[PDB]
Design brief:
Blueprint: H1 6-16, E1 23-24, H2 26-32, H3 41-44, E2 49-54, E3 70-74, E4 86-90, E5 95-98, E6 106-107
Parallel strand pairs: 1-2
Antiparallel strand pairs: 2-3, 3-4, 4-5, 5-6
Protein name: Ribonuclease
Family: Belongs to the ribonuclease N1/T1 family.
EC number: 3.1.27.-
């Protein structure tokens, strides 16, 4: 509904098999007039964070076999600098969190 914590978003994933609806995509923010070069999101598109955008994984930091796909979503980002604390989950719903922007992950699963 308006959830944006590590446990909270992870819960929503596990439960409903989707993100919460408070996370729009980059494209949507951009349509609303957000610019990445410019300041924080909420300014231009309030009540919103980024999520549901692709993480890809080049098969290194998170596991991948056959062709496991990955998507990322913001954690705790209303105002300030751009999201960095983040959470990434796989298609088959193996979940990992980070505070360090994709240096090191930890499973929450």
């Amino acid at each position: 509904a308006v959830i944006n914590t590590f446990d909270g978003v992870a819960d929503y994933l596990i439960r409903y098999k989707r993100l919460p609806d408070n996370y729009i995509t980059k494209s949507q923010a951009s349509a609303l007039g957000w610019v990445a070069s410019k300041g924080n999101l909420a300014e231009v598109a309030p009540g919103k964070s980024i999520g549901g955008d692709v993480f890809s994984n080049r098969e290194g930091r998170l596991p991948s076999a056959s062709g496991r796909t990955w998507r990322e979503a913001d954690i705790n980002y209303v105002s300030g600098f751009r999201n960095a604390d983040r959470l990434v989950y796989s298609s088959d719903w193996l979940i990992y969190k980070t505070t360090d922007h994709y240096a090191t992950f930890t499973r929450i699963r």
